[PDB]
Amino acid sequence: MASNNDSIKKTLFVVIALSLVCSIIVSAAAVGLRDKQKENAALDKQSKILQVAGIEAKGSKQIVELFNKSIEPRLVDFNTGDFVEGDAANYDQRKAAKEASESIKLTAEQDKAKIQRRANVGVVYLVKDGDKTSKVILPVHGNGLWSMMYAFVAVETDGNTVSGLTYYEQGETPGLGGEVENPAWRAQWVGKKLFDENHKPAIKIVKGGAPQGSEHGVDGLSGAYLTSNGVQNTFDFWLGDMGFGPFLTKVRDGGLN
Amino acid sequence: MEHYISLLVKSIFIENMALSFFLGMCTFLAVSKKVKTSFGLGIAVIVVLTISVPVNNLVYNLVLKPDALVEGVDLSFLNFITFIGVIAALVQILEMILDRFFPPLYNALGIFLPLITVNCAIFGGVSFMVQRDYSFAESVVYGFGSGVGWMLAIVALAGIREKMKYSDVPPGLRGLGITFITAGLMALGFMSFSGVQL
Amino acid sequence: MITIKKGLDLPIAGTPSQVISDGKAIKKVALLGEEYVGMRPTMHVRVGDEVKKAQILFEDKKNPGVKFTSPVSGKVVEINRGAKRVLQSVVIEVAGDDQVTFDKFEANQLASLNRDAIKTQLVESGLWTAFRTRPFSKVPAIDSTSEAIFVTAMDTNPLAAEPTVVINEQSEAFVAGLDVLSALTTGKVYVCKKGTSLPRSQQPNVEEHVFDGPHPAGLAGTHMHFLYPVSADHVAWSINYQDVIAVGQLFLTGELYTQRVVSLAGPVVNKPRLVRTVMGASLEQLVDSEIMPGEVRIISGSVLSGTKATGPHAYLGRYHLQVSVLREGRDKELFGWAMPGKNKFSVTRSFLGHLFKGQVYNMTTTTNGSDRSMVPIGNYEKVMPLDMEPTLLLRDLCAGDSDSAVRLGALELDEEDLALCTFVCPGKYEYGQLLRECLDKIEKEG
Amino acid sequence: MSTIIFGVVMFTLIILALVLVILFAKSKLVPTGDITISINGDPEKAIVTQPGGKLLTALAGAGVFVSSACGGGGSCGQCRVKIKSGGGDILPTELDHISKGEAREGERLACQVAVKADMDLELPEEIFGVKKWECTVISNDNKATFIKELKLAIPDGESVPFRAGGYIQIEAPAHHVKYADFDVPEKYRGDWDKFNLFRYESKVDEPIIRAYSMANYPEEFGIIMLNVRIATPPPNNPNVPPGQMSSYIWSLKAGDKCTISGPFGEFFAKDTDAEMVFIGGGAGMAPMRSHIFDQLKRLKSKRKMSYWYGARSKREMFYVEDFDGLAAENDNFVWHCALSDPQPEDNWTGYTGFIHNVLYENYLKDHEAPEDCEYYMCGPPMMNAAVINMLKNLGVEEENILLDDFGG
Amino acid sequence: YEAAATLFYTPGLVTKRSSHVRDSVDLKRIMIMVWLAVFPAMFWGMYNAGGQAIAALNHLYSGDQLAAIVAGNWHYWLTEMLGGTMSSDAGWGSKMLLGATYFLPIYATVFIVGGFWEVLFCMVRKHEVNEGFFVTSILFALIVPPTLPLWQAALGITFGVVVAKEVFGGTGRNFLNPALAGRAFLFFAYPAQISGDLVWTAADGYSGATALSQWAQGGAGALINNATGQTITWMDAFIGNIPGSIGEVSTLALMIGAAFIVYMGIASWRIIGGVMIGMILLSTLFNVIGSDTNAMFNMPWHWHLVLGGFAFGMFFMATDPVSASFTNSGKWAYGILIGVMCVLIRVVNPAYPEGMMLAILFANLFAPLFDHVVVERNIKRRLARYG
Amino acid sequence: LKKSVLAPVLDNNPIALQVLGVCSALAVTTKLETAFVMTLAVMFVTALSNFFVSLIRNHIPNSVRIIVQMAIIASLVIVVDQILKAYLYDISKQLSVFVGLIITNCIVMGRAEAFAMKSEPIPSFIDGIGNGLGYGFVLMTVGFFRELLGSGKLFGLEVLPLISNGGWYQPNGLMLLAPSAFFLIGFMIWAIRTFKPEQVEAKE
């Protein structure tokens, strides 16, 4: 082959040089920008929390100052629903759950699959109007058809009425599962009661659409079975005894204050 | 055993690479003219996927997984480049083998032989393996099943196109356009497994 | 003993009386150029030439050494040519009894003659054109040989004659022809017959095989499929019983034997029967005053596979042993496609006709519908007894895929093998032409 | 920093391992030894080369190779070779020019064949006859408006072994030519002046090769007579660039050095007793003259034959004396000429119109057996189509139709 | 007007070559015979739709409310105007008339639009308009709910005729079922109008599931007719006194119609037998395995037969000659695959309660592959000189 | 020269004539925003990879050419994704699920093999830009119909008011599934070869 490119020495030299190049570049790009990427992710989470709480904000400065002004992170024990002392502002529930110090759920109570472990302490965001509490935001998540889906729920301190819901991290196929992020679909969750008179979970994702005024039903996602099902299972779990059940009971009895 | 049989059936039918997830469509549409050419191409794809998925499983779990080598260093940013390098080496060897021993297939594929590297189905399979965190045996079974499903899809399309020797397609649609429409109809047919969970 | 279960005996009206009688005197005979596959003639006569019996009329360019000779002594009166000056027929007006004479041997010597001597005598007499080759149904090349020669001593075509009646009248000639064929072959000779007795040769390489069932149980293609599967590497020859009698007569008396016994039958023939005629006779003069009034079609051969004998073609054929006559069905009826169908035939049970067993039909030449695409309701499988995929093969022929058709078994077939498939097609396709086109392509391209 | 060095090192090591595996695999799947291709069954004059590359290049290096001008594949199928061993199966492209029966016998295209293993060829005896190329121009005078006759004298009177109707491969170097260099008598300059086309010129970047047929029959030893048609842009498309080699050869003059290849080609007559019918137009006069002279003078054939030539006007016709003498001295030869549209200066009396119609109306309309004789043919493509259609309608078979299809 | 003449009269042609005598059958007779075989199913479907609607209306409303509801629907007040009654004591005539006012507009729309497309394509390609579209249109009209909007019907028939058949060259040239292709287009484009609990009885404001959906929830004990309070029985499902698509309900009527075209030799008893074998095998396997949380595991074969569109599909849609396998051996496999897929989608797929059209469209993709396997075996036999 | 950059739009389209970008065309064409972003990304990556491969085309051994090309392409894609995540987080969020699909987009490697290995740097860059434009033409045309008919929106702006919001339009659910993309591309090819009939395939 021309210009002795077939020589073993030439081949090895070419490949090693072209690896050193593009390796330096990829590594430098990946490691230099990590902090900026994490900052952007955190700012996006704050923006999503504000949006679900119902506060208009634009720009990093406005978002951060409003979040500091209006939202008060807090920790809960799940098992007892009691508020737990701690920072509550730098707590990483994902890391906590991955740590071996936390619980592991057997199939019987693992309603929402592929979540093997649950943290013993969760974080909730209390909306403030004045000095007392107007709402509470609950982070919930569950496995979908493709990956893990995370969302916020914004109950109104009575323990039943939803008042808002957003998905701040999901990777479902656009058009079918990605519609979980549709504003029109998100609008259906306003006013749903989330509990029946016996205080059992009662939120339903109805296949084929829910009758008007159902007061517990939310339309499923067209052509999106198993992801409507994941959305059902996540709530079935997180409203149960293993999730925010006891905490929502203590909120319902007026203990939120 | 039922675990692996369930995984294999899932990969072949419920998550068919071609007619579900619609991956690896370029060569699937281009090289569907003859059943036996499609059969050979599918065998090659099966071999490449079966070898690629386990090797990439090992590489990721041993050097690229967080804290795999030493604590605090994460090399996951090299996932794509490492995976594609492995696949490229495999296709490079496949080229020599086909040239030596299967000259008819080598000539039939033509331009698309080196393009098996960038067949979206293989890279998608490796990525799905990494996301789902399969073990080594599960990786082997998953790669084999995905390859078998892709081969089944392409062979079925080739059979349809051969049956269409009796058709009267308009000149404008002859070839690529009618093949596109046929593939769409096949997708409609394959929507039967939407909602079944293995 | 081989039994064919899939087939069809067409219940057309007017079946012949199996008794031989003298026919109308014939004054003109002809040789039809288009009848022979792949023939490109070279004329050796011109209008106004006097000829003798067995004198050469023309020769084939594409098959050197093969001679086509005159059946009678007389004068050439027409050399008909059609589109692109394609030879249609050479017409001779009978007169005199001059003839060319060849060598004659005794009966006991025929089985041990030299193959080259046999071949030269046949070629010179012009009786070499009785043979045909599967594949391609062409006259064999004079320098070739074959391991299998198939004799057809049965006939299952509708309205066909009874070979037993004809053969029993010429037993010595039939046996002598069988002996000559046994000497001429390099393998076996297959005498295909029905269950009844025939004169038989004492040579050990001549064998009798019995076939039972409906049409096409009596076709050389069927016999070959079951006894000697043919292909590009295995080539068989076929010849009918009357030609075997002619061969025996030639080698016994040194003279060309041109007499025939054909069946004149059909729905419009007053007295169907077998009649003695001569090779290439004029069908117009043969059926003179034998037919009912009206517009009719005269066919050389069976209705399944014959030649419309009009104008320069009538003029009986070389390989045909019967003449069929039936009305021309140009009628146009209202809602005819929707009638119950008491008097309508079909291999489908969608008419009332099939409920009356033993009913014969005065069939006409109507095409009971228009040309349409193929919707395979499974009619072909009912009438094809060979081990093939008929619907797939027919779609291959329609699409023009010669290689695929060859793989599927086109080389084993003749136009007469697809006659029933053409007959029962709801789309009114004609598969003889498609098969011939495919075979021409295969022969030319390689 | 500790996580950049790790990444660089790990990626480079992985790539190096993969490349080493590839090299090891190549060491076994790709042979490196010599091939030793045999150009014929004889145990001599064999060629030993390294593996890889197309077959044609090995023969080119050896110096003896089959005819080809385009040098490519999949178009014009102008290269052929016979192979008995090796060479693999027939590439699909080749089948577009190779019949299945030929493929069974082992015909192949040199361009498409790849040198992977030892193989033996069965090249004919003809291509070994390639000859030295030097030759001297004697004259390049004009004979028709757009045609000139070029005469070449071979050194030492060498008798090039060419058959009637063959052609030679001619070569030219890079050059720049202007039409003003061309010289023509006063007779033909009217057409030139009509367009004032002397402005045309062309450039040849690198040497080019073309093929031409000799106008002399074998008995004319030591001389190569040639007929060349000038490739000029279409009258309706003056902007079209002109032809290179036609202009270059027209540039030559008497006494100039010239280069030709060995004798090659096809379109030879056959050895039957059938009548012959030579029909040609324009540039096709050379093969017809070669055939006619060979048959009448060398072979002294008694078979009947005739020649039919079509021309635009009386000014376009030549060799009239040769053909008239042939007809007068031979009773078996008759020649006729048809003018498409004679001009006033012609004062023409006789057959007019297209040659195919003239021939059909005068000879083939009454012929006893049109299909029996043989039709040798050479002319412009549309005349070729017309005469082929006429003959086919008359019922002549392809085997009796022989022609050279270079389209003047 | 030459359109009527070429449909009423016979061509009056003769034979030019080959066989000088031809069989009496032709494509026109085949298609018209298939067209007539669904008439009992169509008539019973109209009658049943009317009966279901009237029963539901009188279960929901009464008196002045019923009068107001009637006055607000053109179907209802046209039925009353033409002499019928919408009272609970309505007769078979009133029920059939009410069903007709639903079926006939759908059929007319489908026929006109599909005919427009067929005529356009045939004119452009200079062919003769042929039958088969009759079968396509009538089947498509019969396999939809009684409440399907007319514009949706038009879109569905357009898709089925054009995309699935005409671009391939027309009748006999395609590989997919056109009617089921149109139905699938509707099913995936506008699910709310061809699925659920508000579609299968043409009663205003009425909601009710049908047998296949109720067996998913409970067992055979969950099959109850809410309009009348009775329990659906096997005989009710067999005769056709149940809601659903217009022409699918009566298994008895479908069997009567299909016996004729099977006897005549137009439909493939091999395909029908394959479908039956596959269904029986898979349903009995599920019964043997059993399940604690899925009630569909204990549904027997004789119940699978009479529910949903299984009988309609098996008899009239799985037997399309063009879309099926062309070999006798391939027909058995084709039918078995269709039956297996139908039962499988019914049982282990919770998204869909029925799977007949999806199963047929799935098997249409693999029929040529079965043909290929069989023909390759035949070719090997040939190369062996048949031993 | 614009004649060089505009040819692949209709004369040599990477999808309508070549079969090189089908998967992403089926995937990312439910919104014009994602279609536009993917078009830009593919154009940029193909141009740069063609340039870099052509720079060193004379030193690449035939036995590792695929490895070299894929290394360059993957490095470019990874760096681009990192930069988008760092500075254009909003856009990166849309393209995150399809980042990997860019590496195996057959257009990039097909043009590197077919053109860059034979041509010079600037011509290769122009060829990459032209093929990106041709790819974007099909992507945008399909996305127009899909988005408009499946949601009544163009670039997220309401155009056909939906019934769920008091409108009159009922969205088509099949426009959110791949078969709609298959059919749309088929009919696009039909129109493109009805005009410019030189591209019609032979036989039949």
Ligand SMILES: Cc1cc2nc3c(=O)[nH]c(=O)nc-3n(C[C@H](O)[C@H](O)[C@H](O)COP(=O)(O)OP(=O)(O)OC[C@H]3O[C@@H](n4cnc5c(N)ncnc54)[C@H](O)[C@@H]3O)c2cc1C
């Ligand atoms: C074996 C063989 C033998 C032949 N022998 C003879 C012979 O003896 N006598 C004879 O007269 N001819 C003969 N020919 C035919 C032909 O005259 C020669 O091939 C001649 O050498 C070709 O002319 P050229 O190479 O000078 O023109 P080229 O430079 O090859 O040009 C070919 C033509 O294309 C045109 N052209 C170029 N570019 C364009 C463009 N962009 N658009 C449109 N048109 C364009 C040119 O103007 C010219 O008309 C023979 C051909 C063959 C194959």
Ligand SMILES: Cc1cc2nc3c(=O)[nH]c(=O)nc-3n(C[C@H](O)[C@H](O)[C@H](O)COP(=O)(O)O)c2cc1C
């Ligand atoms: C031929 C045919 C095929 C059908 N295919 C399907 C199908 O694939 N999926 C579906 O959900 N319904 C399909 N249906 C509709 C159902 O058979 C039936 O009309 C509907 O399910 C009635 O309500 P039920 O499911 O409660 O019984 C089909 C109907 C027919 C006639």
Ligand SMILES: Cc1cc2nc3c(=O)[nH]c(=O)nc-3n(C[C@H](O)[C@H](O)[C@H](O)CO)c2cc1C
């Ligand atoms: C027995 C039989 C069944 C048919 N079934 C169908 C059918 O289910 N759908 C349809 O569109 N056409 C049907 N047709 C008509 C025709 O065969 C079909 O449209 C072809 O696929 C057209 O090429 C049927 C025809 C026959 C004879």
Ligand code: FES
């Ligand atoms: S295989 Fe070509 S882009 Fe997916």
Ligand code: FES
């Ligand atoms: S055309 Fe010259 S080598 Fe093929």
Ligand SMILES: [Ca+2]
């Ligand atoms: Ca947790």
